[PDB]
Design a protein around this ligand. Structure first.
Ligand SMILES: [Zn+2]
Ligand SMILES: [Zn+2]
Length: 66
């Protein structure tokens, strides 16, 4: 899974906010591919199985997985 990052979020301008927005709002420490502005998803998280203390892969909220 490779999710499109919210360009408005990246420039400090997302008026929808993270909860509503259907694009990714990744943390500054999260792996991002600058070639296409996507974040590769943590597949463990999708299954409720990510127990890593500091995972560097995007954990998509429920409304993005929908
Ligand atoms: Zn957004
Ligand atoms: Zn994870």
């Amino acid at each position: 899974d490779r999710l499109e990052v919210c360009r408005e979020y990246q420039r400090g301008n997302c008026n929808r906010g993270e909860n509503d927005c259907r694009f990714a709002h990744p943390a500054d420490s999260t792996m991002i591919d600058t070639n296409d502005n996507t974040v590769t998803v943590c597949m463990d998280y999708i299954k409720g199985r990510c127990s890593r203390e500091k995972c560097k892969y995007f954990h998509p909220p429920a409304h993005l997985q929908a």
